[PDB]
Structure 1
Amino acid sequence: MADPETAAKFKSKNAFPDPLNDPKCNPKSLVKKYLTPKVFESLKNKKTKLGITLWDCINSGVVNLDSGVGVYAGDEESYTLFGPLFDAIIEDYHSPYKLATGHNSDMNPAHVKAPDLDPANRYIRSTRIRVARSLKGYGLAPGVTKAHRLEIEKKVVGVLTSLTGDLAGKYYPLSGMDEKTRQQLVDDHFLFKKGDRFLEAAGINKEWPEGRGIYHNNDKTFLVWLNEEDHLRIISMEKGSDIGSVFSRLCRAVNEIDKKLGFQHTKKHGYLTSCPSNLGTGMRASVHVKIPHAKEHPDFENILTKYHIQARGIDAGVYDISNRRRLGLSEVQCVQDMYDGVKALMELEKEAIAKKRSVFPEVLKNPEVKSLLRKYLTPELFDSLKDKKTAKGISLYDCINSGVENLDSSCGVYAGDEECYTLFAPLFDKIVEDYHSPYKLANKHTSDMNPEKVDAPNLDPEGTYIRSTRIRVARNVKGYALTPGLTRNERLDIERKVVGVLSSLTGDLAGQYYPLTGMDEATRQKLVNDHFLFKKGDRFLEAAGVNKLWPEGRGIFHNNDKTFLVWINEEDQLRIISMEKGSDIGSVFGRLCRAVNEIDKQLGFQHTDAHGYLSGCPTNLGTGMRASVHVKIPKASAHPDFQKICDEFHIQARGIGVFDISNRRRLGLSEVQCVQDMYNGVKKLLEIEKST
């Protein structure tokens, strides 16, 4: 509801803005509240050295009557010259701050004591810190000249492009930006466009888009908007909870710019901004956190009040926590209040969950729940294990959570790390030996990725019966938790290490990596069509803690021949797939071993004598293998020796007359033995399909 036509009538006469007395005007409007006829008369003929008038400052609030604030400062002098208006607006908006009290700035990140709150990402989803700043020697955004805006861009870009380490990146000016770059910044949510009706009426859109630009570091955890609403809008942000690191990164960039260029800053106002709402710290610090139980707690609102923070919607139970204050507290204090506030809120969520988890899951008492979880989790077993935690902080309840939340689970138990299989052995042993029957853990498991130990002459080089051959192995990188118990930095380290290895793959294994984070739709559809794409895990994986921080750290690798595929950090940290059209099981497995053995040599896999290769899902232990053969068999299908064969070789057929022959077992036999069995069995199914 912008009416610049009406406002211009009064502005060109330098007369009092009668629209402020329109009943349509926001009752809460600070310009309406404090621009009285006497204030107008007293200041209407005054100008700053940059020629800024009272009408220039109040115009947006007159054009846009729904304005909450409704004034912008054209320059520093505006804050003093039109003081009778600005002081009143500032001390209202920033109550209880008084200009007489003075403001204290502090951008030393060492003053902040913020041990990482939630590395495991159990509650906090993301952290963000923004500051607004303006350079010394120029007007503010509504008043800055055409040449000065350009000079500001030149000076800022000079500093930003000299940034090293995690702050290193690239500047993208808006002027002359091409279509592809524009689109990329849109996908990253880094792009800004021409100012809205509030900025327009403030004169901020002058010379658009000249002098405007966007800078971001390579990690995309640092962003600068140049010459938008203020000279600088500087943002440090990332997934997870590490606000101390976020703030430190922010300070290192801001202090350098300060060092080289200098900011507009006063004792009374702190850092000067176009909108008086952004004075003082110029800061908006925020955290996304899931605290559905904290909201109902009687101390919830007292915590927010105590730390001068606020909680709003953004995802169920997820709140955007942010600061309320900018004047009267330093930037360090804002961050510290934020840390302490979020910490207090999280602890409330933790208490409620702990209490709920202190007792046997009542829902497991329904005798119609037929999960292996229900079968083996006796109340006695529960009480005996409920108070133990792995070195990585995994509880029994973390392990059984998915089977509790999803009662229709077949199994319902996941391991958060290797230690779970031992620390919670009384549960896991029973589940492993049930699902992987007849395997016993005392038997132990033998891995074997030597493809030469497989004797597999090509069964059908024609292509008559066997349409395709596929062999997958699930693996997890040694030195880390399992998927459900991964911290943010572990997952990122795994992606980095794995991609590093995969990029060095030469020959027929050479390919490229496609991360899910920042994937454009074209690349996506390309992958979908090759059946290479995976998506967020279902409710079972969600409840197990697998989907944390999706899609960060997830990605896809394939070779140029479309015969080798790697999924990174999906259900397991590594899903490695070898595949060919035709029947050459031997070739497929040989390619698989070459890739897996090399990754093994460089990184190492999680593995035990008793469980073979470790996975967060107990069903994927041992070989962690699925060997698959798309075949056409009705003759042998109907043959009375079908059973004897499919049972002698531990294989199984399902239809998708195309059938899917896959292996039954994963523990108690090596990868070599599993492949040989598949060959030996599919062979016999062909030595009937072929007969006459």
Structure 2
Amino acid sequence: GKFFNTAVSAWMSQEGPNSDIVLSSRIRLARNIVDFRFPTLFSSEEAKQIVALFERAFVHRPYGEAGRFELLKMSELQPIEKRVLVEKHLISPHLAEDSPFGACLLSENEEISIMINEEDHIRIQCLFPGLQLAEALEAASELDDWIEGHVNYAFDERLGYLTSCPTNVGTGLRASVMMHLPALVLTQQINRIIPAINQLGLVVRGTYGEGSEALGNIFQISNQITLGKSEEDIVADLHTIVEQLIAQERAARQALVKTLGIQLEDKVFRSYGILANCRVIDSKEAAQCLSDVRLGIDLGYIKNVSRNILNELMILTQPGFLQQYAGGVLRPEERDVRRAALIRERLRMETRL
């Protein structure tokens, strides 16, 4: 399967602005279709009719340089295929786990993922590498008007796009950035920054882990406000705070180099040595060591290792990709052995080059 082969698409592997700290930018637009009940209330026959509506209008349809759209029906996917789409960030856990007649319209280049029958009938997602919030909003807005030519959105003049989701009321817009902030975590500035960010109207969560955890020091920053503010203003305010976070993380990295010197070089190389040689490693230690190694690459200590090892190995070591790597279902202890072996082989391949 084309979409299931790779952890990160060619599109997302491009270098974008500030790609050392900002992994990616995302615009999501939620809408519901007139004359169908909300997903909270509709029947499976209604869900099927929505999928059939989108198939009629868009399957195999060209979208210019993005290629044609492919329709992936949740009713036709194995659970492991669904899990891989989640780990690639192409579909949500809600779509994979809770939408039996869900679907995803995927552009051939994997820039565009339109979820069908999630918490709203439609969730338009546009993904860009690095910090490209303006470009992703323009792409999502153009796609939004293009879809609206074939489907009729439920829209109210005062309340905006109708939805059952309190966090989508109004614009239906969620803008977010994925950021690697190892220096702010190590200097313990995060527990100060998060409450400050909430005051400015933004939300922070960890991409990986459980609860308040942010394994690999990878964080997602998004807007909280969706009603009473223009989409452009929502995105411009996020962009401002993100650029402030980039400068604080860069400042913290230079402070660590000055304060720790050879001790920091020792820390990132020890993590490299563990990843390159261990035979058993759990998810928490692997993510931490991968974060350390990326920091070492960014700062220039670690040479001859592509920085994309963080992006790619964080995804490839998730349970679905790990089962695919191993060729079959894995028990708990085999998982830690397979995880170490996958990382070892990748780092060995980096040395050969």
With the length of structure 2 as denominator, give the TM-score of the two structures: 0.62
> How far off its partner does 1:256 sit?
0.9
C-alpha distance in 2 between matches for 1:240 and 1:167? 22
Deviation string, structure 1 residues 448-493 (Cα, Å, up to 9, x no partner)? xxxxxxxxxxxxxxxxxxxxxxxxxxxxxxxxxx7557689xx99x
Instruction: Name 2:147's counterpart in structure 1.
Output: 257
Counterpart of 1:470 in structure 2 is none
CA distance in 1, matches of 2:222, 2:272: 39
Aligned to 1:268: 158
Please tell me whether residue 184 in structure 1 is matched to residue 81 in structure 2: yes
Say if 2:137 is the partner of 1:247.
yes
User: Which residue of 2 is the match for residue 325 of structure 1?
Assistant: 225
In the other structure, the counterpart of 1:166 is 66
Determine if the alignment matches structure 1 residue 309 to structure 2 residue 202: yes
| C-alpha distance in 2 between matches for 1:188 and 1:348 | 33
CA contact (8 A) 1:117 1:343 kept: no
- Stretches of structure 2 that go unaligned for 5 or more consecutive residues are 1-14, 208-214, 274-295, 329-337
Structure 1 residues 230, 533: CA separation in 2 closer, same or farther (over 3 Å shift)? closer
Q: Distance in 2 between matches of 1:138 and 1:335?
A: 30
Q: 2:7 — aligned with what?
A: none
- When residues 142 and 298 of structure 1 are mapped into structure 2, their CA distance, relative to the original with a 3 A threshold, is closer
Q: Runs of 5+ in structure 1 lacking a partner?
A: 1-114, 196-207, 370-400, 421-427, 429-481, 493-514, 539-566, 576-692
SS in structure 2 opposite 1:284? strand
Q: How has the CA–CA distance of structure 1 residues 349 and 260 changed in structure 2, closer, same or farther, with 3 Å as cutoff?
A: same
Distance 1:346 1:148, change over 3 A: same
Q: TM-score scaled by structure 1?
A: 0.34
Mapping for residues 215-230 of structure 1, pairs under 5 Å? 215-230=105-120
User: How many matched pairs?
Assistant: 282
Residue number in structure 1 paired with 2:184: 293
What does the per-residue CA deviation read over 1:193-249, in whole Å, with 9 as the maximum and x for residues that have no partner? 564xxxxxxxxxxxx845x32322334343222123221122233564433443344
- Give distance in 1, aligned partners of 2:220 and 2:17: 16
Match of 2:248 among 341, 348, 357: 348
> Quick one: distance in 2 between partners of 1:316 and 1:520?
17
The residue type paired with residue 183 of structure 1 is: I
Counterparts in 2 of 1:131 and 1:483: CA distance versus 1, 3 Å: farther
Q: 1:297 to 1:143 in 2, by over 3 A?
A: closer
CA shift, 1:267, in A, is 2.5
Instruction: Specify the alignment match of 1:337 in structure 2.
Output: 237
1:125 Cα offset (Å): 3.1
Matches within 5 A, 1:191-590: 192=95, 195=98, 209=100, 212-237=102-127, 240-291=130-181, 292-293=183-184, 296=189, 300=193, 304-305=197-198, 307-314=200-207, 315-357=215-257, 359=258, 364=262, 402=265, 405-406=268-269, 483-484=304-305, 521=323, 524=326, 534-537=344-347, 567=349, 570-571=350-351, 575=353
| TM-align CA RMSD | 4.5
Q: Contact 1:222–1:235 (CA<8 Å) still a contact in 2?
A: yes
**Alignment partner of 1:157 is 2:157:** no
Q: Which amino acid aligns with 2:85?
A: D
- Considering only CA atoms, is the larger Rg found in Structure 1 or Structure 2? 1
Shift of 1:309: 0.7
Gap change, CA 1:301 and 1:524, over 3 Å in 2: closer
3-state DSSP class of the match of 2:149?
Answer: helix
Question: For 1:224 and 1:516, how far apart are their aligned partners in 2?
Answer: 23
State the SS of the aligned residue for 1:289: strand
What does residue 130 of structure 1 align with?
Answer: 28
Tell me, yes or no, if the aligned pair for 1:281 and 1:327 is still in contact at 8 Å: yes
CA distance in 2, matches of 1:169, 1:145: 26
Percentage of matched positions with identical amino acids: 19
CA displacement, residues 577-633 of structure 1 (integer Å, 9 cap, x when unaligned): xxxxxxxxxxxxxxxxxxxxxxxxxxxxxxxxxxxxxxxxxxxxxxxxxxxxxxxxx
Q: Is the 8 A contact 2:31 2:161 kept in 1?
A: yes
Superposed CA offset, 1:362-416 (max 9, x none): 654xxxx9xxxxxxxxxxxxxxxxxxxxxxxxxxxxxxx6457448999xxx998
More helix per residue: 2
Amino acid at match of 1:342: V
1:506 matched to which residue of 2? none
CA distance, structure 2, for counterparts of residue 524 and residue 262 of structure 1 = 45
Cα shift at 1:347: 0.9
CA contact (8 A) 1:312 1:321 kept: yes
Q: Does the 8 Å CA contact 1:136/1:264 hold for their aligned counterparts?
A: yes
Rounded to whole Å, the distance in 2 between the matches of 1:305 and 1:536 is: 38
Which amino acid letter does the alignment assign opposite residue 255 of structure 2?
K
8 Å CA contact 2:25–2:128 kept in 1: the answer is: yes
Q: Is the partner of 1:125 in helix, strand or coil?
A: strand
Q: Answer whether contact 1:309 1:321 (CA < 8 A) is retained.
A: yes
For 1:408 and 1:231, the matched residues in 2 are separated by: 45
